[PDB]
Amino acid sequence: MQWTDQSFIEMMTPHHQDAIDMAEMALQKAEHPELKKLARNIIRDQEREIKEMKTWYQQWFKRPVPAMMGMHQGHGMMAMDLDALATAQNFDREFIRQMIPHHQMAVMMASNLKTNTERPEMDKLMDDIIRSQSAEIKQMKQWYQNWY
Ligand SMILES: [Cu+2]
Ligand SMILES: [Cu+2]
User: Fold this and answer.
1) Cα(first)–Cα(last) distance of the chain, in Å?
2) Which of 52, 71, 113, 133 could form a disulfide with 3 if both were Cys (CB 3.0 to 4.6 A apart)?
3) Centroid of ligand 2 to alpha carbon of 78 (angstroms)
4) Range of the domain at 137
5) CATH number of the domain encompassing residue 106
6) What is the DSSP string of 64-121?
7) Are 147 and 50 a contacting pair, CB within 8 Å?
8) Which of 80, 107, 108, 109 is closest to 95 using CA atoms?
9) 124 Cα–ligand 2 center, Å
10) Which 3-state string (H, E, C) describes 1-58?
């Protein structure tokens, strides 16, 4: 029903990781230059966000971020598939196919936590995640239509 600051960070940290791995693969495997630029931005932003959340987590809860089970498909965690990306005939298509719902997931988590948090740090972070990742979705949707 409702995320807390702690639970959000615990779930979002692993989720930001799979995205980064997808984006790192794009640096070499992407076909369109538009996509490599998006990938450099995703890496930059999401790694910066991971760091802020990890710092905040230690400050507020007096422990590092807890590492349950690993992140992968089959459990409704809405995780991604790096193997399928690497083997796809059309890299950019498969990247966009997987990244859009993954981005939408983050936007929805952010919007929800934004109604539950009292912390200005999280409010600010949620704002940026929503705004930045919604524009990235909009870019990817347009590119997908043009290319395919
Ligand atoms: Cu994820
Ligand atoms: Cu499993």
Assistant:
1) 37
2) 113
3) 12
4) 1-148
5) 1.20.1260.10
6) PPP------SSSSS----HHHHHH-SSHHHHHHHHHHHHHHHHHHHHHHHHHH---HH
7) no
8) 80
9) 34
10) CCCCHHHHHHHHHHHHHHHHHHHHHHHHHCCCHHHHHHHHHHHHHHHHHHHHHHHHHH
CA distance 18 to 71: 8
Distance CA 90, CA 46 (A): 25
- In one letter, which amino acid is 146? N
Resolution of this entry, Å: 2.0
Experimental technique for the deposited model? X-ray
Q: Residues with beta carbon < 5 A to ion ligand 1?
A: 15, 18
Number of domains into which the chain is organized: 1
